[PDB]
Amino acid sequence: PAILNPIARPEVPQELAENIILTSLNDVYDWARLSSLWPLMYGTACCFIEFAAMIGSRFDFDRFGLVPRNSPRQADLIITSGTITMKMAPALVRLYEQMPSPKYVIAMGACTITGGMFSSDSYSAVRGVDKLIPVDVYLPGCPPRPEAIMDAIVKLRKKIANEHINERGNLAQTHRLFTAKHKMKPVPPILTGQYLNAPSRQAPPP
Amino acid sequence: KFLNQITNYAKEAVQSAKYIGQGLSVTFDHMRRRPITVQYPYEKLIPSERFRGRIHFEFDKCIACEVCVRVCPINLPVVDWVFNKELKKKELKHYSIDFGVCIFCANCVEYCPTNCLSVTEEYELATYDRHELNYDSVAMGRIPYKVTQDPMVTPIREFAYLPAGVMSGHDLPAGAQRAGERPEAIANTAKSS
Amino acid sequence: ILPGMTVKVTNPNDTYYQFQGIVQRITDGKVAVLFEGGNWDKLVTFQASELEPVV
Amino acid sequence: PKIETRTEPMVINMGPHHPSMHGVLRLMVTLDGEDVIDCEPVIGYLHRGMEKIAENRTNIMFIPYVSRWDYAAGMFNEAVTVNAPEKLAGIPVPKRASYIRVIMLELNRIANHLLWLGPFLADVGAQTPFFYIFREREYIYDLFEAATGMRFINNNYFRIGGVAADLTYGWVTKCRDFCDYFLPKVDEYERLITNNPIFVRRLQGVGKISREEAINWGLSGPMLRASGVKWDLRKVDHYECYDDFDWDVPVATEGDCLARYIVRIQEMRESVKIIRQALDGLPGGPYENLEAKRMLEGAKSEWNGFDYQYIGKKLSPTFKIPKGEHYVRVESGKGELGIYLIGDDNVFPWRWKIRPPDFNNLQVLPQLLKGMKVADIVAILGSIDVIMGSVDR
Amino acid sequence: IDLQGQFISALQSLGLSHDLAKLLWLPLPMLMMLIVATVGVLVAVWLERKISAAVQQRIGPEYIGPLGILAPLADGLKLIFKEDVLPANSDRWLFTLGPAVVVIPVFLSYIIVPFGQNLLISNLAMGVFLWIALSSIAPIGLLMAGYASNNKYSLLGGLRAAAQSISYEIPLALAVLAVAMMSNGLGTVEIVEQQSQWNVWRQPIGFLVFWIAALAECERLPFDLPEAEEELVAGYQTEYAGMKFALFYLGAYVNLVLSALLVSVLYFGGWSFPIPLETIANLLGVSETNPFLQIAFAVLGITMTLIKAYFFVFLAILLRWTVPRVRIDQLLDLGWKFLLPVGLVNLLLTAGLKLAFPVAF
Amino acid sequence: GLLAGYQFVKDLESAGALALFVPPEGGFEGRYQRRLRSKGYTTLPMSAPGLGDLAAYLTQEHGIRPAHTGKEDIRVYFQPPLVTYHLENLPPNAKGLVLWLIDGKRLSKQEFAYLAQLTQTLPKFKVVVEVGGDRVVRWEPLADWVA
Amino acid sequence: MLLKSTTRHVHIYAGHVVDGEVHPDTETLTLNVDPDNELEWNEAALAKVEAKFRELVANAAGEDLTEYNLRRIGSDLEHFIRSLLMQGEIGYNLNSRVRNYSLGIPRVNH
Numbered sequence A: 001p002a003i004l005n006p007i008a009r010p011e012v013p014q015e016l017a018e019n020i021i022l023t024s025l026n027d028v029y030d031w032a033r034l035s036s037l038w039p040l041m042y043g044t045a046c047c048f049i050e051f052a053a054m055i056g057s058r059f060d061f062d063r064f065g066l067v068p069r070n071s072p073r074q075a076d077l078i079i080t081s082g083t084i085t086m087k088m089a090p091a092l093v094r095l096y097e098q099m100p101s102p103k104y105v106i107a108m109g110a111c112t113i114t115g116g117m118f119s120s121d122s123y124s125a126v127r128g129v130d131k132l133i134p135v136d137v138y139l140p141g142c143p144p145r146p147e148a149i150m151d152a153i154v155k156l157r158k159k160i161a162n163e164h165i166n167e168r169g170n171l172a173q174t175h176r177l178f179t180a181k182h183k184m185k186p187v188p189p190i191l192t193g194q195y196l197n198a199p200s201r202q203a204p205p206p
Numbered sequence B: 001k002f003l004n005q006i007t008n009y010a011k012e013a014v015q016s017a018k019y020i021g022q023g024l025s026v027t028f029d030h031m032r033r034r035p036i037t038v039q040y041p042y043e044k045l046i047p048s049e050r051f052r053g054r055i056h057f058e059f060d061k062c063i064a065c066e067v068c069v070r071v072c073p074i075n076l077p078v079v080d081w082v083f084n085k086e087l088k089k090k091e092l093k094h095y096s097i098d099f100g101v102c103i104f105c106a107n108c109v110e111y112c113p114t115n116c117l118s119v120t121e122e123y124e125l126a127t128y129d130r131h132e133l134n135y136d137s138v139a140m141g142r143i144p145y146k147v148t149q150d151p152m153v154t155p156i157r158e159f160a161y162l163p164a165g166v167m168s169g170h171d172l173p174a175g176a177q178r179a180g181e182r183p184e185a186i187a188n189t190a191k192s193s
Numbered sequence C: 001i002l003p004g005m006t007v008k009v010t011n012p013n014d015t016y017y018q019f020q021g022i023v024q025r026i027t028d029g030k031v032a033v034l035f036e037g038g039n040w041d042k043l044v045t046f047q048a049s050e051l052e053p054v055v
Numbered sequence D: 001p002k003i004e005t006r007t008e009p010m011v012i013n014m015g016p017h018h019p020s021m022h023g024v025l026r027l028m029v030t031l032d033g034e035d036v037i038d039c040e041p042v043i044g045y046l047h048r049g050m051e052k053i054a055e056n057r058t059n060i061m062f063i064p065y066v067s068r069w070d071y072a073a074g075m076f077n078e079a080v081t082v083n084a085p086e087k088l089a090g091i092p093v094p095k096r097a098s099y100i101r102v103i104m105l106e107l108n109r110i111a112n113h114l115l116w117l118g119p120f121l122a123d124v125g126a127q128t129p130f131f132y133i134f135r136e137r138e139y140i141y142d143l144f145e146a147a148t149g150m151r152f153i154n155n156n157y158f159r160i161g162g163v164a165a166d167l168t169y170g171w172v173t174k175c176r177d178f179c180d181y182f183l184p185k186v187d188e189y190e191r192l193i194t195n196n197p198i199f200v201r202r203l204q205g206v207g208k209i210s211r212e213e214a215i216n217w218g219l220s221g222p223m224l225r226a227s228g229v230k231w232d233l234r235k236v237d238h239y240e241c242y243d244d245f246d247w248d249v250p251v252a253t254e255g256d257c258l259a260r261y262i263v264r265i266q267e268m269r270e271s272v273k274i275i276r277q278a279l280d281g282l283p284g285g286p287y288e289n290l291e292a293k294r295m296l297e298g299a300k301s302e303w304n305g306f307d308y309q310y311i312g313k314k315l316s317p318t319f320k321i322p323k324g325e326h327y328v329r330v331e332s333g334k335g336e337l338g339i340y341l342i343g344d345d346n347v348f349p350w351r352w353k354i355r356p357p358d359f360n361n362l363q364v365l366p367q368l369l370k371g372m373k374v375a376d377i378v379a380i381l382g383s384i385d386v387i388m389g390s391v392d393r
Numbered sequence E: 001i002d003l004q005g006q007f008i009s010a011l012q013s014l015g016l017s018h019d020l021a022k023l024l025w026l027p028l029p030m031l032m033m034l035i036v037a038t039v040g041v042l043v044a045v046w047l048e049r050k051i052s053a054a055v056q057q058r059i060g061p062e063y064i065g066p067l068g069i070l071a072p073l074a075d076g077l078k079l080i081f082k083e084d085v086l087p088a089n090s091d092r093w094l095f096t097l098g099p100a101v102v103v104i105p106v107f108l109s110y111i112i113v114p115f116g117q118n119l120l121i122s123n124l125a126m127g128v129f130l131w132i133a134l135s136s137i138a139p140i141g142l143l144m145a146g147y148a149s150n151n152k153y154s155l156l157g158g159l160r161a162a163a164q165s166i167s168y169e170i171p172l173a174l175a176v177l178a179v180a181m182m183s184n185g186l187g188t189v190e191i192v193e194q195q196s197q198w199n200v201w202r203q204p205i206g207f208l209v210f211w212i213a214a215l216a217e218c219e220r221l222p223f224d225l226p227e228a229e230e231e232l233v234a235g236y237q238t239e240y241a242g243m244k245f246a247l248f249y250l251g252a253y254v255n256l257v258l259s260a261l262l263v264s265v266l267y268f269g270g271w272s273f274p275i276p277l278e279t280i281a282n283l284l285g286v287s288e289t290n291p292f293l294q295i296a297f298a299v300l301g302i303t304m305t306l307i308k309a310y311f312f313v314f315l316a317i318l319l320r321w322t323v324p325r326v327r328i329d330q331l332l333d334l335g336w337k338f339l340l341p342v343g344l345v346n347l348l349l350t351a352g353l354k355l356a357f358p359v360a361f
Numbered sequence F: 001g002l003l004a005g006y007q008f009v010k011d012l013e014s015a016g017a018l019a020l021f022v023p024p025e026g027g028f029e030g031r032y033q034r035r036l037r038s039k040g041y042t043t044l045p046m047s048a049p050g051l052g053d054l055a056a057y058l059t060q061e062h063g064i065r066p067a068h069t070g071k072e073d074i075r076v077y078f079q080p081p082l083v084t085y086h087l088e089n090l091p092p093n094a095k096g097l098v099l100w101l102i103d104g105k106r107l108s109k110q111e112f113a114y115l116a117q118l119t120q121t122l123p124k125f126k127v128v129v130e131v132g133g134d135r136v137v138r139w140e141p142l143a144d145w146v147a
Numbered sequence G: 001m002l003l004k005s006t007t008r009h010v011h012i013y014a015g016h017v018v019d020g021e022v023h024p025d026t027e028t029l030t031l032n033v034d035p036d037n038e039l040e041w042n043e044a045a046l047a048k049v050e051a052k053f054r055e056l057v058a059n060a061a062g063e064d065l066t067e068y069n070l071r072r073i074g075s076d077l078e079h080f081i082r083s084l085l086m087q088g089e090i091g092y093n094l095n096s097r098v099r100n101y102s103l104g105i106p107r108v109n110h
């Protein structure tokens, strides 16, 4: 109990590389990667609109190479814009894990870094996305000026330019997985088609 | 019976061709106009006079009445007072605001009685660690950014500070004023006849 | 130019031209002027040369 | 590795990840060969609990919250939130504040219709107009950011006894400039678009509600006025400073996506008339003129009167709304907003309920998809102007 | 000059089995055309991103290189280093093969792109007909990308892609048919040498049909159905991540520079600075063995080919942001209901005019 | 000159506190941090606008007060010194610990002088402060650039 | 279809991972503590977490297999993980990854 929430204090110090050729090639590996980030077209709530304003002509993130992508397979950056309720939290983790490994996260708006104005007396909003996925950059503010989203992009580019090709080991998932039988009465799914063809829609009960 | 159908087909096809040619001409015209893009990192857009940025806190003016905590939508500002016993004076020990939870509605700045709390034009907050967004009583003053006093940024006014008739703020002279006269000037003119 | 004084802004190339405020804090040669007006007290930093200590 | 085709109705999930601006909506839809048998819309992916929050926040603490139900225009819902306790307390709003409120609501209606118009034209065509609305939608952002603190939503510019503060100095002239620069383009839209025969046959007869079924299904918005009902809460309720301006409540008769588009464009065009008619008639005119008159003679003169103030008496954050329920309403961009405030004796209300227009216009998604096509799903979605922020309550 | 003559002669001067020298030269043009195709792809990506920005009062990539010149390089190198995913129950071998079958025959059709006479890889006797035959393998690639997926989202996209690429193959062939009627043959050099003083002025309907059919090869926003983001997420591409997706991203712009060059050579001509240049006997140049005049006219021909290829690349990526999309059924009515009848009519008209007035045809 | 050697690390080891002048696009200074990290130095960037006295946060302890929002009456945390705690948690063969400050423009000349002086004492501790500026990634000792 | 409770450093599913897939089963309740390696683990701590998971899935379960109950189990597992991290049995990773202290900052236990 000396220091609560302690740190690792690891061993086997770095095993990093030094020769000029490999670091010069790492320079290109990191330049190609940070100057062509493709965000996922993913909005949930208010902040998305400012993100869309960041797409528009008034100031587009097309420069420094950002092209919004629809499927997560081609996306390498998810700018989480909007409040994430408990109904949709697993719908985000999925979209995050369903997306190639050299990937990044930006939590924009107050509702994705601490819960925001809903951090009190709300029973459905996830109080920050940092408890769902590994956020890289936080920008505060109900809807942040779309030249603050670009400031977050600057601070994310200067973080991407830091990576090391001799360090991509800290990029896989360890998968410490277990198993335990249960007895819990599987129920039928209550979410199917059958909205207008349902028998209760066609005639009132006697 | 069959000729009317064909004349309708022709009147539809030629119309669809003209209404594509017109759009083609409009788009080919659009690429002559100057881009409205505000090239942010080197052309930062100077904010308004009421823009609600980061909160600024003057430790010396605070009297610890906690109205900032009371009119806050989420009771955010942490105020730690101790109530010294000289005669009745409250003493401030730590004022803070978690700007990660902040909403930037500035109700706190509206109801500060002592003008101890103000808004700024710092919209460029971003960190790698949200625990670094909790501002001490000292990290809050810090003399705001002032985009204009930046050697690598050409400030660009927004639509409300451009002279009459002007729409964009890119190719602007060095002597423009907002839109009209201020009240003191109008009163001075009315003073002389 | 000292804190607490009421000042005006004399710089035709600024959005806060001919505004009047009160000096809240001065550090490193630059000042911070608070314009109490509208609804939310604004605070912006000016150089020591873009002011004038109005009486 | 395959999907094993079989002769059944196929169910497809246009799930929460909509790569568009139509919020988060799931829409499990089944189809029999490029038709629609029935769809089950799964709303709720943005329910943050505004109704339970409103019961625990005082009014000025809750007024920043409201700018979220139906993002866009984040001043309609501010207007109804201000009107709710204002009516119970019977607090009189001055006329200048009423004119500023009218101007803000009309600019917000224009912005709402622009935000609806962009992705609508995108889903029935090209992606360039999305870059044109946001060139035209920014000129209103930059007017809000002068008047109130921020851009669109999180303005909290409204107050119970009026409006948080007067306009800036060079504001009326610049709003005039914007109106004169924008009014030709609401018609330039119908010039560059709305006449492509392929584009008008696309939404010619897809989506349809009879006048007698839109009343039954409660489609308060322009979805009603597109079905031949000359009825908007601005002329039937005599909203605050109306009957002081000319009125052409636009209505179509067929009740289809094309009718919705036409009504929305004519309404966006009438909003500019309302704004230009109010601007020339503020109780005090532009704020620099009013301030000059007040500093020249308004020490005691009539220019310092109650009818020329931006607010009534400034109220404490402990307003303590009185006892007694009632239902308030405002004709927003998507139709009628409704707050069924109750209140018992204190600052915290009792059952602050929100009646959003999109929540009722969305009830006929299945009826409007009664076997139309698989392709006109997005057009019917865009014809309703769905905003999931107003589908949380 | 005849660089081939000099190469084979200087290589045979030191022995090396003269017949073997001719085998040691094939890689030279076989990779010069690869170089120009890759540069054309980079140019097409850059032009799209920088012209769509000008059309919309915007600025394209500007922080990559001086003018965003390095933007396609970055977008390619990123997709190289990206982790590739192969979903749970998808097939393992038709997956990694779709994006290659949709690409190999698009590259192979560069045999027939002239860039001036004696400046092309092996002017073939089948020429444009070989291209018509080779452009029919990509639908197999799309069906392969759709069949090898556990995603019913993307099988429906592969089907509607393979059903659009076959709808615009009959009119695309009936336009080249009318061109080959006048051209007396099928080889591209023999097709273009009939312009000795342009086919667009005598085939004003076949030009329209050819151009529309080529733009409707699942390429441009006029159609681009399997890429139409809003109606469906990327169609069949929705599951490819690294270089496998870059093969789609790349095989769609090379399939555009190719079509631009082909419209140029069919209806305009990769030669002929408009005046009948080869009647520049007024400078008394002995072209025949003029050591230069040869290089001067080579440069003129290359420039005149690239001008008219860039004209159509520009016009295609301009129509992308001008013409509204059609659902899928307004698309399949262009072919088989408007383009196929008009193609047949143009063919019959060219036949009637060639039988009646054999001069000028 | 489009590719850099290791002069940055030598200059940091010599001066102790540098003051970068990165271009305002932020993708061309990360390679210098990677050069630093490849030598043995460990970095930790903490976005200067958000630290306190810079002496209570770096050297001494300081009581962080989290955001109670109506619940959970005021509580302090006392997080350990952001430097003395990271000098103990260095990897086995670590050449030192350099401190990266992203938005150095917000600090004042007094705080810059303090950060410069702190490098001489407290041995295994260098400082880089990205004061905004020039269109090329140039550096300059932090003892200079002030007064 | 799967039924899962996926949060940071806890991932409960309703199937059996045979080689990397999931294969919904209706009684396996797999668990995937800390995939992204926010923390550094030991052999004793992982055993404690597995034991807690077992006594949480077995000793208290006769209810439905709705996603509500799966979330209710995952929440308790994550509270247990946070308690382990508070007591000091485990610690943050400190590696060159994102390093955002999602479970709290290090404090000094005054």
Ligand SMILES: CCCCCCCCCCCCCCCCCC(=O)OC[C@H](CO[C@@H]1O[C@H](CO[C@H]2O[C@H](CO)[C@H](O)[C@H](O)[C@H]2O)[C@H](O)[C@H](O)[C@H]1O)OC(=O)CCCCCCCCCCCCCCCCC
Pocket (backbone or CB within 6 Å): E001, E002, E003, E035, E036, E038, E039, E040, E116, E117, E118, E119, E271, E272, E277, E278, E287, E293, E294, E295, E297, E298, E299, E301, E302
């Ligand atoms: C990414 C896209 C861009 C990337 C660039 C491509 C990478 C290559 C970079 C190297 C560039 C250096 C080459 C210098 C160009 C001059 C070489 C030339 O013109 O050589 C031409 C010769 C000509 O060949 C001979 O040409 C003769 C006559 O010309 C004939 O050419 C045509 C056929 O009839 C015409 O119709 C003409 O009338 C006709 O007479 C005969 O046809 C012979 O049979 C034939 O062998 O071919 C040859 O070796 C040419 C073979 C090499 C091909 C490379 C050409 C590159 C294009 C450069 C154009 C420069 C434009 C101006 C530059 C300055 C700016 C103003």
Ligand SMILES: CCCCCCCCCCCCCCCCCC(=O)OC[C@H](CO[C@@H]1O[C@H](CO[C@H]2O[C@H](CO)[C@H](O)[C@H](O)[C@H]2O)[C@H](O)[C@H](O)[C@H]1O)OC(=O)CCCCCCCCCCCCCCCCC
Pocket (backbone or CB within 6 Å): E001, E002, E003, E004, E005, E027, E028, E029, E031, E032, E033, E036, E039, E040, E043, E115, E117, E118, E119, E120, E121, E122, E123, E257, E302, E309
């Ligand atoms: C021991 C290990 C060995 C391993 C081998 C691997 C190592 C590789 C060796 C080095 C790599 C070099 C690669 C390129 C070198 C250039 C070779 C060349 O110059 O090769 C020359 C070739 C060959 O064709 C030329 O052909 C004529 C000769 O006739 C014969 O040439 C051809 C071959 O027979 C045809 O069959 C022709 O009909 C036939 O008659 C010429 O006079 C020359 O003799 C002959 O070489 O040129 C052509 O093929 C024409 C194609 C080029 C045309 C250029 C147009 C350029 C495009 C514009 C550039 C800008 C583009 C950017 C914008 C793009 C947007 C669209």
Ligand SMILES: CCCCCCCCCCCCCCCC(=O)OC[C@H](CO[C@@H]1O[C@H](CS(=O)(=O)O)[C@@H](O)[C@H](O)[C@H]1O)OC(=O)CCCCCCCCCCCCCCC
Pocket (backbone or CB within 6 Å): A020, A021, A024, A025, A027, A028, A031, E034, E035, E038, E064, E065, E070, E073, F001, F002, F003, F023, F028, F135, F136, F137
């Ligand atoms: C069919 C065949 C086809 C095959 C396909 C071909 C594949 C080609 C792959 C190679 C493409 C690489 C392009 C790189 C372009 C680029 O870097 O962008 C230019 C940018 C622009 O910024 C620059 O930076 C400078 C500022 S600053 O100092 O960096 O801050 C300043 O110069 C200005 O900002 C700008 O100029 O440069 C950088 O930002 C820094 C990145 C450093 C790049 C490393 C240098 C290249 C070395 C190559 C490796 C050689 C190894 C031996 C060396 C000892």
Ligand code: SF4
Pocket (backbone or CB within 6 Å): A045, A046, A047, A048, A081, A082, A083, A108, A109, A110, A111, A112, A116, A117, A141, A142, A143, A144, D068
């Ligand atoms: S972060 Fe702010 S603006 Fe964005 S959705 Fe949440 S409350 Fe609205």
Ligand code: SF4
Pocket (backbone or CB within 6 Å): B061, B062, B063, B064, B065, B066, B067, B068, B069, B079, B111, B112, B113, B114, B116, B117
């Ligand atoms: S700043 Fe104002 S509201 Fe806050 S504690 Fe001080 S006096 Fe009270």
Ligand code: SF4
Pocket (backbone or CB within 6 Å): B055, B068, B071, B072, B073, B074, B075, B076, B077, B097, B101, B102, B103, B104, B105, B106, B107, B108, B109
């Ligand atoms: S900005 Fe809003 S949340 Fe922050 S202290 Fe002021 S009133 Fe409270």
